[PDB]
Design a protein around this ligand. Structure first.
Ligand SMILES: O=C(O)Cc1c(C#Cc2cccs2)oc2ccc(-c3cccc(F)c3)cc12
Ligand SMILES: O=C(O)Cc1c(C#Cc2cccs2)oc2ccc(-c3cccc(F)c3)cc12
Lengths: 138, 138
């Protein structure tokens, strides 16, 4: 469970936002991409696996089983793709809405929204939780 | 020291690679950017601060004191910019060289190289070190 992620897509302003959630913490990473092409997901997954333990990525549809570059990225980095395992996507759009005028590019708003999600709660934030799970594991 | 980073630039194939090193671990993040414009560094810094504790960013030159968007990003996220505090850039180009044919875009090679740097050593890797410092700190 230190290494289990979910990968989803949400849409704002005709752009695609790639969302990775660390299922045990609620920690999120996101990127705005022009078009959802296989090569985009592959770059995002390779960046995520260089940064954290990424052992299993669950997706809720078939799109990610049809990309040879996602498959090649996953092989290289030692990532198992799994089919099946959220309301994360709703929280994110709430925060993105509050900040949308505060900056020009959708992608800056997306990252401010990831920052608030990860750093907010007095218990632990999702950001402390992921470090605590992986530390506690090491 | 959990929150202290260095930010540098290196160059390959007429593109700029933005490198953040967590000084106490040797953990690195990198991005290929078209052109070094203020807005690029600002997006990278906001992504890094959503992911980790980023309290102080040291740079070795003046470029980052002249961008209103780096300044605005740093204010919003609570980042102190500092002037002054590597051979990281040499290790990275060694690994990038070994993988360069293994993939099309320079940026994929850059990320495979970050992955190897972060996961390699039997002591601790830079990736376990950063999680151990922040966990040990929390
Ligand atoms: O560079 C490529 O060849 C295609 C590619 C992208 C991308 C992108 C972009 C997004 C937006 C504009 S370009 O990310 C990757 C990650 C892994 C592999 C790969 C492939 C084989 C073995 C391996 F080890 C890795 C290939 C990619
Ligand atoms: O969206 C913008 O307005 C400009 C911007 C970029 C970028 C980029 C790109 C890179 C490559 C193509 S576009 O990253 C940022 C991070 C923070 C702030 C900012 C500004 C004021 C307050 C605050 F809280 C944040 C502005 C940006």
């Amino acid at each position: 469970s230190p290494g289990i992620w979910q990968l989803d897509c949400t849409h704002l302003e005709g752009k695609v936002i790639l969302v990775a959630v660390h299922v045990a913490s609620g920690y999120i990473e996101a990127e705005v991409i022009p078009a959802e092409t296989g090569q985009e997901t592959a770059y995002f997954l390779l960046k995520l696996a260089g940064r954290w333990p990424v052992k299993t990525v669950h997706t809720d549809n078939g799109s990610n089983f049809t990309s040879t570059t996602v498959k090649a990225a996953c092989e290289w980095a030692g990532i198992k793709q799994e089919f099946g395992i959220e309301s994360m996507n709703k929280e994110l759009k709430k925060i993105i809405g509050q900040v949308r005028d505060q900056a020009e590019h959708l992608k800056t708003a997306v990252q401010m929204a990831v920052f608030i999600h990860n750093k907010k709660r007095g218990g632990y934030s999702a950001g402390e939780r992921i470090v605590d799970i992986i530390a506690t594991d090491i």
